């Protein structure tokens, strides 16, 4: 889910098995640094790639003059009537033809997909 970096030689940690206690042990394999972690996860893979597109949409897209604007869908936590809607149109998104709405008010980067 995430790997920290070495405190001694600034390299990348890697999993290692120890027989003294049988606990997960992230060990840097360049130097001899040792570290015990608590996440207890090594590798996760999104096979159907259900990645939340709402986080990857940049909140500053709402001021693009080339994007359409409609007042039909108002902002949820902002209350502004008009907003900017678009499609992601990217790979690893299956159909990728469902609208994502971004509020156009300044200092409000709320994105909802409806």
């Amino acid at each position: 889910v995430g790997i920290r970096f070495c405190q001694e030689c600034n390299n990348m940690l890697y999993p290692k098995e120890d027989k003294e206690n049988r606990i997960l042990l992230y060990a840097c394999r360049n130097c001899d640094y040792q570290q015990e972690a608590d996440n207890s996860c090594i590798y996760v893979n999104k096979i159907t790639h259900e990645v939340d597109e709402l986080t990857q949409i940049i909140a500053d897209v709402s001021q693009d003059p080339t994007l359409p604007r409609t007042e039909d869908h108002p902002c949820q936590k902002c209350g502004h009537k008009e907003a900017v809607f678009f499609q992601s149109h990217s790979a690893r998104a299956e159909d990728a033809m469902r609208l994502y709405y971004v509020c156009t008010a300044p200092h409000c980067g709320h994105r909802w997909t409806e």
Binding site: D60, Q63, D64, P65, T66, P68, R69
Partner: protein, 193 residues
């Protein structure tokens, strides 16, 4: 015939046989950029709030927009809204930036690309602000008396009503077709021209 040959490559004129599609011709208003020094633009950016590339840490890049001048990474910025409003105003006023210089903002990637080198192909377009042309009637009446007045196309560009837009800036422009239509009060297609 690619989609971005609009306005600066003729869609009709093309030779036949083995050469079809490869030998193209400029449009009527196409103006290939002659080239300029990137030193005044780089001097303006370092004078502004832009931080230098070696000055920053490799941790503030994620929440900032990279600045590209002639394809070279030169630093980052934290206020891209004010930078484009300043850069576009300075090109229209023709103060320090030559009118052939094209600045492109890729908001979905957070990149700013300023191109200055020769070889770019540009065409002139009018300027629309708040759904109104900046080309008022006083510009037409001055241009209708083009001689004995020392008023020409160069004074129209310096008045801030006509910009030169290349194909790469046309990715991020919303271009009105004709002022007779599409710029009035009806069922709205796009209110930000």
């Amino acid at each position: 015939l690619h989609n971005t040959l609009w306005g600066m490559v003729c869609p009709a004129e093309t030779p036949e046989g083995h050469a079809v599609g490869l030998v193209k011709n400029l449009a009527l208003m196409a103006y290939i950029s002659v080239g300029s020094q990137p030193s005044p633009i780089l001097e303006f950016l370092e004078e502004w709030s832009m931080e230098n590339l070696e000055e920053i840490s490799p941790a503030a890049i994620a929440d900032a927009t990279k600045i590209f001048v002639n394809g070279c990474w030169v630093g980052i910025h934290k206020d891209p809204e004010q930078l484009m409003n300043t850069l576009r105003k300075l090109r229209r006023q023709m103060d320090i930036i030559v009118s052939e210089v094209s600045m492109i903002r890729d908001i979905r990637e957070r990149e700013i690309r300023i191109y200055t080198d020769a070889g770019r192909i540009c065409r002139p377009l009018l300027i629309v602000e708040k759904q109104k042309l900046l080309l008022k009637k006083r510009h037409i009446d001055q241009l209708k008396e083009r001689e004995y007045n020392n008023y020409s196309w160069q004074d129209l560009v310096a008045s801030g009503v006509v910009e030169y837009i290349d194909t790469l800036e046309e990715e991020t422009v919303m271009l009105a077709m004709t002022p007779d239509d599409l710029q009035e009060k009806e069922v709205a297609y796009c209110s930000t021209y």
